Amino acid sequence: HCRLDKSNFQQPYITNRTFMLAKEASLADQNTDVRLIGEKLFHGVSMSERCYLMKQVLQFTLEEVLFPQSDRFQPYMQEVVPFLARLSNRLSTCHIEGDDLHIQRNVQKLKDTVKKLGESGEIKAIGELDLLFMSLRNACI
Amino acid sequence: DLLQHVKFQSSNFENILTWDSGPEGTPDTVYSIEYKTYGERDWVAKKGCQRITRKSCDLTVETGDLQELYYARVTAVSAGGRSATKMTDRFSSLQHTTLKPPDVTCISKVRSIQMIVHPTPTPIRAGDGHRLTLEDIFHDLFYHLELQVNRTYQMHLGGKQREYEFFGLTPDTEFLGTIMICVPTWAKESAPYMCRVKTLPD
Ligand SMILES: *[C@@H]1O[C@H](CO[C@@H]2O[C@@H](C)[C@@H](O)[C@@H](O)[C@@H]2O)[C@@H](O[C@@H]2O[C@H](CO)[C@@H](O[C@@H]3O[C@H](CO[C@H]4O[C@H](CO)[C@@H](O)[C@H](O)[C@@H]4O)[C@@H](O)[C@H](O)[C@@H]3O)[C@H](O)[C@H]2NC(C)=O)[C@H](O)[C@H]1NC(C)=O
Ligand SMILES: [Cl-]
Ligand SMILES: [U]
Ligand SMILES: [U]
Ligand SMILES: [U]
Ligand SMILES: [U]
Ligand SMILES: [U]
Numbered sequence: 001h002c003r004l005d006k007s008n009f010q011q012p013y014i015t016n017r018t019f020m021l022a023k024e025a026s027l028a029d030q031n032t033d034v035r036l037i038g039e040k041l042f043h044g045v046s047m048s049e050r051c052y053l054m055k056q057v058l059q060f061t062l063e064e065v066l067f068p069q070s071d072r073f074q075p076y077m078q079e080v081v082p083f084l085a086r087l088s089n090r091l092s093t094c095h096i097e098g099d100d101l102h103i104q105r106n107v108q109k110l111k112d113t114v115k116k117l118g119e120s121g122e123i124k125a126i127g128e129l130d131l132l133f134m135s136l137r138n139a140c141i
Numbered sequence: 142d143l144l145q146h147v148k149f150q151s152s153n154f155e156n157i158l159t160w161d162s163g164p165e166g167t168p169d170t171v172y173s174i175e176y177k178t179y180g181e182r183d184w185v186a187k188k189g190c191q192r193i194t195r196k197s198c199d200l201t202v203e204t205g206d207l208q209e210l211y212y213a214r215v216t217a218v219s220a221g222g223r224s225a226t227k228m229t230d231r232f233s234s235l236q237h238t239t240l241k242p243p244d245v246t247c248i249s250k251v252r253s254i255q256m257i258v259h260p261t262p263t264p265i266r267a268g269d270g271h272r273l274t275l276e277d278i279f280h281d282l283f284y285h286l287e288l289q290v291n292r293t294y295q296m297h298l299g300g301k302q303r304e305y306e307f308f309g310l311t312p313d314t315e316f317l318g319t320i321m322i323c324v325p326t327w328a329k330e331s332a333p334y335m336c337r338v339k340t341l342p343d
């Protein structure tokens with residue numbers, strides 16, 4: 001199902017770690033014109049499908065952002081990735097009861113923006129792990 | 142050198158931009174402020190904070206969209222026509238804001254102490270333009286109340302409702318009441334509110 005216990009986000013240490021990882025990367029992100037994760041990412045996505053969408057973003061972030069950058073931003077990277085990874089795993093059995101179009105398109109625009117920005121795009125994504133964390137929290141309860 | 146510590150000071154969503162003067166600073170230095178929304182391209186000049194001599198600027202209205210994140214930058218122009226620009230880190234009011242003490246009213250009775258929490262209004266406007274309260278913004282917000290009788294025995298209540306009443310109290314006695322706002326999602330905790338009360342005679 002598409003839901004995550006509230007206890008996954010109530011933990012101060014791993015959360016501050018995520019936010020500090022996000023902050024360190026944002027200081028390095030110089031592009032203030034482009035924001036990856038926001039309300040537009042939900043553009044035409046039913047409230048009951050937001051968690052599913054965030055599962056996709058999270059998965060992509062793990063595979064095309066974090067892993068490729070697992071060397072930078074230490075020592076936060078080292079503790080956060082495994083945390084986000086578990087959440088991703090938890091959602092590995094989350095599916096929607098409809099067509100995957102309006103959603104797929106939405107996630108693709110994000111993947112596209114990140115690729116077009118290249119390495120700095122990956123940096124930007126990390127700097128937005130705080131936004132990802134919260135969107136992920138509000139969408140999956 | 143000229144500009145240092147450019148940052149937002151946020152309390153109950155009142156967002157004030159502040160900064161200091163660095164080493165090569167001087168008293169006749171003027172400052173000009175601009176702000177922008179993260180994810181947008183243009184910087185907007187803050188009408189009331191251009192060429193000012195003070196070291197703070199109220200950006201509450203400009204940064205009041207709870208869905209956006211912002212940036213602000215100060216441009217200092219020193220006595221010699223020398224200038225310098227510095228901007229804040231990405232700003233998220235939901236994350237950085239501090240919470241003032243709860244609006245609470247303690248009513249004492251013969252054998253119980255009553256505490257009424259009132260909605261705390263913020264500058265955040267809804268579509269219809271009215272003011273949203275902290276409760277409107279933070280859905281998981283809850284209160285933590287405590288009634289102290291002495292160094293070794295304290296009563297405690299908690300919840301999302303506004304009215305609380307501690308029972309089992311001895312008349313004409315003194316108690317120290319404490320109430321604080323808690324919002325777990327953002328790990329925020331308001332300054333405590335304290336009301337020292339005494340139960341009625343009998
Ligand atoms: C700090 O505060 C505590 C508790 O405060 C009181 O209780 C709370 C709930 C509020 O109502 C406050 O307004 C009250 O002041 C104080 O402890 C109390 O100490 C008094 C002694 O001065 C105790 O009263 C005595 O209790 C005796 C035993 O009664 C109980 O136990 C028996 C056997 O287990 C049982 O049968 C009975 O039913 C009771 O459960 C009793 O014989 C005697 O006559 C007298 O009533 C009282 O019990 C204590 N309260 C509690 C719940 O702990 C501290 O004294 C105070 N500190 C100071 C020094 O100010
Ligand atoms: Cl409130
Ligand atoms: U992927
Ligand atoms: U899918
Ligand atoms: U200098
Ligand atoms: U203001
Ligand atoms: U907005």
Ligand SMILES: [U]
Nearest residue numbers: 251252312343
């Ligand atoms: U009484």
